[PDB]
Structures are given as C-alpha cells and as structure tokens.
Amino acid sequence: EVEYLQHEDYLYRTSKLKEIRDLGINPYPYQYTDCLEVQEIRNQFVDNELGDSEAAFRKETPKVRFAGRLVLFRSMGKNAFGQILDNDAKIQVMFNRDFSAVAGLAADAGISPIKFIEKKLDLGDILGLEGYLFFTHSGELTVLVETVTLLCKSLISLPDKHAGLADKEIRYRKRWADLISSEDVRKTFLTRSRILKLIREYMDQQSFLEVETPILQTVYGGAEATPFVTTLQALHAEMFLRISLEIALKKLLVGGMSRVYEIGKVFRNEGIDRTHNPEFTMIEAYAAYWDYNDVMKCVENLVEYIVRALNNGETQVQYSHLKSGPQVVDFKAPWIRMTMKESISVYGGVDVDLHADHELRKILETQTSLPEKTYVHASRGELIALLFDELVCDKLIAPHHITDHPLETTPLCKTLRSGDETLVERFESFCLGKELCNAYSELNDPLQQRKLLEEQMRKKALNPDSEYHPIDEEFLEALCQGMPPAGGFGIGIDRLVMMLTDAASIRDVLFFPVMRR
Template structure:
C-alpha cells in the first residue's frame, strides 16, 4: 500500500490553518460558550428533497415552508450582500442562502469568517434558486462546532488509501461512496436478522472471552483476568457455546457478533471480524444449503432490489440454483488434467503439491492433501455461487461423519467470487467421537500446530446430556458485505480495520 508523506510545505500550511482557526475559537470562547448544545434540528436534508424537491419554484413563495437543519459546511460561496453554503448531514446535503436582508448584516458578516468543516445550525424558509436547486433562505444561523482542521483540499475526498482506513471519520465526511457502503452494511445485517427472526430463530449473545478457545481451527488472542488469576482467550468462534444452548433446549438460535483470530492481515482477512452463526435442531447440512440460498436471495432482493449483482465487473446471479461439487469434482472441473485416480493417490498428491510449492502437513491423509491442492489451485476460480461438499473428517473436527463414508463429513463451504463465504455442517453429536477428535487436535497442538483446537471437557459433558440432531452454519458478514457493495478489500467494509501502528 503506497502512500506519499505530506510535504514540509503542506504540513506548514496545515499548521498555519490550524493556528488561524484556533484563534477564531479563542475569540468565540471570549464571547461565551464556544460549543453550545441548545440547538435542536427538526429536518434532514434528504427528507426535505424528497418531500419538496419536485415542487415548482413559484409554489414556495405562496407557502412559506419552514425548515430547521444542521450539518457540516462542505461548500461556501461568499459574495457581497448574500452568500451560499452547503451543509451535509447524515442523510445528504442542502444549500443555505445567507443574506443581509434575511439573515442580518451581523450574522452574515460572522458567517464570512466561518470555515469549511464548521458545523452549523440554520433555520429559515424553503425556496428554489434560478437554477432550480432546493435551498433554505436563512433567517437564523448558528455556529455549533468550530472545526480546527481543514478538510482535504477542494473537498475532493481522500486519495491516500491508508489515511482512509486510519482516519475513517475523515473518509466518511468526504466520500459519499464510503457512507453508502456502511449504510448498506447496516441494512444487510438487519435484513439477515429479519430473515432469521421470521423463521423463528432466537437471537442470543454468548461470551467473547473463553477459558478454552474452540469452535474453529485458528490461533487465538490471549489475555489474563487479574481478579480470577486465569488465562482467557478472545473467542475464535461462538460455535461451542451456541451448541450448548441447543443442548439446553433453545433449538433455533443465532448470533451476529465479533470473532478474533491471531492471523495475518490481507484483502480478505482482518484479525477482528463479524460472523453470523446459526443452529437448528432436527435439520441437516442439505437443509442448510437450501436455507442459505433462500436467505441470500432475500437479502439481495431486499437490500439491492435485484438478485443479480455486479462484483468486480462480473455478474453474479442469485436467482439460479447454486452448484454443488465435491472437492475433487471442483479440482477436475477447473483443472481437467487431473484424474480421479490421481487425486486418490497420496504419492501423486504429495509430489504434485511439492512441485507447485504448496505447503501441506506431512501427516495429512488424502483428504487433507486434496484440500491443500484445492485451496491453492481452485478456490480462487469459483466465481459463481457454489457449495463445495463432503469435506474430509480429518479437517472437520466438529462435523458429523457421513453415513455412506466415515472418512468424509456432512459439511459444505459456500464460495462466491473466489472466496469462502460460509461454512456449515450437520453437527457431530456423538460425545465419544467428539472426544476422540478433540484428542487428535490436542496432539496436533502439542506437535506445533498453533491453530489446532483445545480439548474442551465441559463441551463433551454437554454432549453427554444429549445434543439433538442439529445443523449449524457460519457466514462471514464482512465478506458478504464486500460482495454486495462491490468492494475489493475487507478493509473497505470494516469501519476501523486493524493497521500497523502509526509512525
């Protein structure tokens, strides 16, 4: 991520501007409270445009429609006896007309010293300019907050990518597209919540700090609780706690919340991220695939108004049934040079992975080796929605084994636009099998696998009381928002992504 450091001259200019604005603030302090909190806004810009934007210019003269707005000044045009300003609130922008005749000479004179970025309150009547722009003829104007730092030059917005992430508040002020992304993110999450509640799921909250990290193969962040004198871990997944709730009789539950994984940062990974996890008793993974298709179609139709969306100049159509393939079927589909016999040979797989320079665990079975080949050669090619099914048991420590083949599990991962969006399976509810798999994970951890799971004896105890047949799934909210907002990086859809310490 390249960036240009501010020049000495530009830094000097900014320091000069800040100094001048501080002098103005000091003058305000001398005249009373420089940060008043008595002004109460009554109208939003977008609502005024929606309600009155189509009215004729002449109709405003007859009605004298009152408006009381507030927002940040983003444009300013000063003239002799009259000036224009544009303020921006949470909904959009509206133009103000400030004049000696209507606002008063003293207030207009004070306005001329206001700066871009200042937060104003304005009251007056609506009218349309000669060019047809809905505006407010201001009769009362107040400076509510003095801005000490200048907005980016000419209000063109931020161009430095790291500054956008580090100073998200400035990005939100200056970039309408950024505001749209995060508005859409909120709508996506709310629509998912509405869909699940409509299907009688109960929203719950489970712990964020775990005495034993579990629910996913990932390296956790660790901390220490002083009063209890015990190690704790930020959760890598809520799965084991949610399934404890199903044991307790809460048979349809979901949680939308944060997970934390101590791993690398990339365009698709942030160490703190948002997940949806949901569980339903007396269902299996095939039901979840159908349910997920329905949910994503519902979200697309509700939020975007269409089931066809564009991502990175390609169209993704959610109206069509999602494809379903095994790992080996997917590899052979996108790489016809491989045969099923080759992909079933451990010797071939290890030799091929070595030739391609792909890291793999030497202790992996054929299923794990196939997955390593798939991850590096095929995953990025899965653009259209596709469920990859029948994952090896050795890499699925919490999933139920297939009745037809105990070496694989009733599990899927959903891929869209070349990345994993969801992971779901029929839950393993055999406490003895789960205990054996935890033991295998514990041995892997002792052998140096930092992402292997711990042995969770209380979870085994919960299973011994009886977990009904259950299906569960996790969906990465951040990656889903990337998809729906056509964002190339996960940092574009997280308000405050993790960054290196600022120098």
C-alpha cells in the same frame, strides 16, 4: 508531535474563538431543537411547487430548521451562497445582508451579520439554519437563511475531498474524514447496517432466537486459529478470546433451544490482508433436526433474500476488484452444488480417485507452488483438501457449495450417512474465490466426538508449531446430556458485505480496521 497544532489553519481558526465569545456567542452551544433532516426536507418539498427567491424574501414559502456542515461557500457581496451537508444529504443556502441574522450577534455589535458569516465562520463549521425554501430557476432546492446559529467551530479545514493513496491510508484510521468527504464510503457503511438488519429479519422469520455467549473463555475451539490471550485479574486467570461461536451455541441446543443464532465478534490472531482482519463479525446459527442439506438451502435463501432487498428484487451484483477483471455474480438460488472431489475434476482437471496416494503428491509439486513439506507426509484426505486449495478455490467465482470434505478437515461433523467414513457431511460456500460459509450435519455422538478430539489433539497436534489445547470436557459432558441432531452454519459477515458493496478490501467495510502504528 501533533502536527496540525502548528498549522496556519488551526492557529487562525482558534484565534476566532475569543473573537466569537467576545461577541457574546457560544461557539459550542448545547442543542439545536426542532430541526428537520435535510433528506426529509427534500422528500417533503422536492416535487412541491415552491416559489422563487422573491417568494422566500417575502416569507411566503415553507419555513424550515435544519443543521449540518458548511462544505461550500461563495460570497457575492450583498448575498452569499453555500452548501450544507447533513447526514449524506446536501442543500444549498443563501445569506443576504438584510435578511439574514446570526443568533447571539447583538444589533449594536461591531460587525454585521453578513460580515460575521464571511469572516468568523469557516468551511467545516457546523451550522443551524432557519429560513425559507425556494427553487432556483435551474430547479436547485435552496434555503434563504433568516437566522444562522453557529453550532460547532471547527478548528481544522475540511479534508481533501479526493484522496490520493497516502491520504486514503490515513483515513482508515481517521475515518471521520472519509465519511465527510466520500459519498461512496457513506453508502458502503449504510448498506452494511442494512445487511445486518436484513440478516436478523430473515433469521427471526425462520424462528431462530438471537442469543449472546461469552467472548472471554478458559478454552477456545470450533475453528483452526491461533487465539488472543489475556489476563483476568479477579481470578488471576489466563483467558482466551473466542475464535468462533460453535461450542457455546451447541450447549444451548442441549439446553433445549431448537433454533439459536448469534451475530458476534470473533478474534483470530493471524495475518492482516484484503480478506482478513483479526477482529471480524460472524453469524453462527444452529437448527435442531436439520442436516447439512437443510442448512445449504437456508444459507443460499438468506443471501438471495438480502441481495433482492438491496437491488430492487434483482439477484445479480457487479464486483469490480478481481484480478481477472470486473464480474457479475448471480446470487439466485439454488447455487451450484458440487462435492470437493468433483470440483477438483471440473476446475482442477484432475479425477482424484484415478490417482494413487504418491501420485497425488507428484501433481502437487508440478502443478502448484506449495512447499514439499506440506505434502511430503500428508494423509490422503489432507492431500485432497490441498489439491482443492491450489487448483480449485480461486476459480469459484459464481456462488458454490462444496460438499463432502475429508474427515481430516474437522472433528465436529458427522460422516456421510452412506457409510463412507473418510468424508463428512460438511459444505463450504465460495464466491469470488473466497470462502463465505462453513456448515455441518452436526456431530452429537459423544463417544465418536471424544475419539475425534483425542485424535486431533495427540496425533495431529504433535507438530512443534501447534499450540496445545486441552480436550473440552464440559462440551463432551453436554453432548452426554444429549444434543439433538442439528445443522449449523457460520458466515463471515464482513466478507458478505464486501461482495454486496463492491468493496476491494475488508478494510473498506470496517469503520476502524486494524492498522499499523
């Protein structure tokens, strides 16, 4: 059952509720008006020349109102000292038997203010503090409390501040306990919100318009993933949650919007690990009249701009959690640019074009651990893509753009303008061994687009494991209306946040990651 309900701390704390109410005090009052943030008080008076505690007892120093969680308390007889935590900022408080009052505690109440503070309040309680600032002689900003208001009676103790492994697992669900206890977790999620704001700022200054498109669709596409399925009762209809943003934003290009982007949740019904949460956040952005080379500059300039805003103009970032040891990656533009075939020579030590189809298969079995079935009857392009996965991807620690993928890797990209129809003008961006961005010179030839989707459906998806998706005819009709030439990209925002906050796992950049029962 619910275990804390029989814990001593809960039973003891709850028995104070009737005692506090019997004193005429509401332990869950309605507001605390006109109260500054602790951080704003610090900013306002940290270099100020405030008096000492005696100036505060004489009420000569500035008077403040603020609120927060009691996280430290020590009674010293006539005086008590404490620490209030407010929205990632801390400040010391001092209570005095003669100077401090408790809001709502009558003079003819049977308990003194200082004793109420010691006996009826607890660590974890949320308090409103009104009082006078001073500096200790060590320079610690402190508030001499004139009136303390109980704002919330907490019924369990503060979480353990320093979590072991088992507690850390629980706190991926009980995330509030992490946020109370850990400055580092608080900073991570503050940086995440800042990153999302920097993305919108950059896109807006490039004249992209932000839109929303449906998560629930009768189709799915724009990526290779098992979808989530659900039922819409009004129409008695099966619906898919989107696996990507691509098809919807391309229809808006046909609709005439030259630069669109969307930052949204997508859903891939796949595995859970350090880099995969089934619900994650993507940006996709499309710019008419661009190709993948324009997109490549846009993507690296976006990331460089975010890194500079977060790191005082510096472009270098430390990441600590690779198995190879702590690294420094420089996000300065331009990033390393290589074709896939080139990356296999440089990092895999294999010049792909000097080997025959059957010869490439022998390299796989000998130099990799892939199952024989993966490469036994794979086409040449698929064989190159597999050699990249196993011999190159993990060596891509510094930011890389990998260009010119085999046609097999996607049906939505134009082929190389040189006339080489076995490769597409695609790039994928990699950093710290993980994929960060996917981008195309977008396909807008409607007849070629149909042929590629038909050959992906029939020819490729006759594998017993693949879930049949029918050809998206509304998308082909939109292309017939006419989509401009365009360049588009998608970025896994959660993975970007990981690289910029030194997070070992995607679970560390999501408030509430998917968790087992």
